[PDB]
């Protein structure tokens, strides 16, 4: 699921999604899969930042259902200028994948 | 999960991976996500073909953890061989999404 | 995961716990299963009423990873003092499962 | 999910059903939770072995939904005959929950 409004850093299984770089901004701790950002009031198309948990892999779409440009986020990383990845206020789907 | 033995075509949420090429030879249904092939016994590095269902994305990764070169796959869509993307007999984690 | 603060009622999958009686004090949205509260911190040994979503089912226990004394809460329900049922301040694992 | 068919031990996350005692006859391996059995051609109310895989937790209710009668299978478990439990041919729904 998401939650709105984040602090810290991401455990095992999650992701903090920022409106503003640097993780600034209204924030999201997603967990699982979104196939559609927009059924996050707010959040489609405007993560600018973004942090991933440990033993945890993120992939953001470009659309809706994971189509579109996408790029692959490593455990316990983070980008804090999306536009640097092509993909600053675009995003609209998302896989949260762990392992041990 | 995991199970040995297929037949017909996936439904959503279900990826077919055949030994052999052509959907021949040992095969398996997994649904959900796969961080490492080496946990299903000969199940890594010997695929060659596959079946994605319906309203399902499928990602193949050369190695465990979903690291290295990877595809993907789109929703009811099949490849007989998949040295055609580079990835006969090396697939080694996969992350098999669905949405509406 | 979970969420620090809530209001109002929670949703299908969605369990609110509050640290006091009556749904006061510190409170956390829950959804899917948290094998041991102390991942959550200030979370473990402190809850005292709890409400549960429609189409929800809860499981409380006094220890972690599901182990101890535990109780059955049923879709939209709700338990002002958990002493009621011998579990105040006792809860470090639950598991949150939904039905249609 | 659920497989039709399993072999040896369940693994983190994975329950084997079968139907007679002693893990004889047909057999079904589920991961995650199935609120009705009937879902499944078959598996409701004939289960009367049971297995449970390492860093796992299992549910099993006699009604569908998670209701009625039910107990919980500790980790690496097994019950060889479930009228020792109370349970034999009737289980309806199963939570299957895992923890580091
Ligand atoms: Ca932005
Ligand atoms: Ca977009
Ligand atoms: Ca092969
Ligand atoms: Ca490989
Ligand atoms: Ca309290
Ligand atoms: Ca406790
Ligand atoms: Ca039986
Ligand atoms: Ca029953």
């Given at each position: 699921?998401?939650?709105?409004?984040?602090?810290?850093?991401p455990?095992?299984?999650?992701?903090?999604?920022?409106?503003?770089?640097?993780?600034?901004?209204?924030?999201?701790?997603?967990?699982?899969?979104?196939?559609?950002?927009?059924?996050?009031?707010?959040?489609?198309?405007?993560?600018?930042?973004?942090?991933?948990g440990?033993?945890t892999?993120?992939?953001?779409?470009?659309?809706?259902?994971?189509?579109?440009?996408?790029?692959?986020?490593?455990?316990?990383?983070?980008?804090?200028?999306?536009?640097?990845?092509?993909?600053?206020?675009?995003?609209?789907?998302?896989?949260?994948?762990?392992?041990?």
């Amino acid at each position: 699921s998401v939650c709105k409004g984040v602090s810290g850093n991401p455990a095992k299984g999650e992701v903090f999604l920022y409106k503003h770089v640097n993780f600034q901004g209204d924030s999201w701790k997603v967990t699982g899969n979104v196939y559609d950002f927009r059924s996050v009031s707010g959040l489609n198309d405007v993560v600018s930042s973004v942090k991933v948990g440990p033993n945890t892999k993120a992939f953001i779409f470009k659309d809706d259902r994971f189509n579109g440009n996408f790029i692959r986020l490593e455990e316990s990383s983070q980008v804090t200028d999306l536009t640097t990845r092509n993909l600053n206020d675009a995003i609209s789907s998302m896989i949260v994948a762990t392992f041990e």
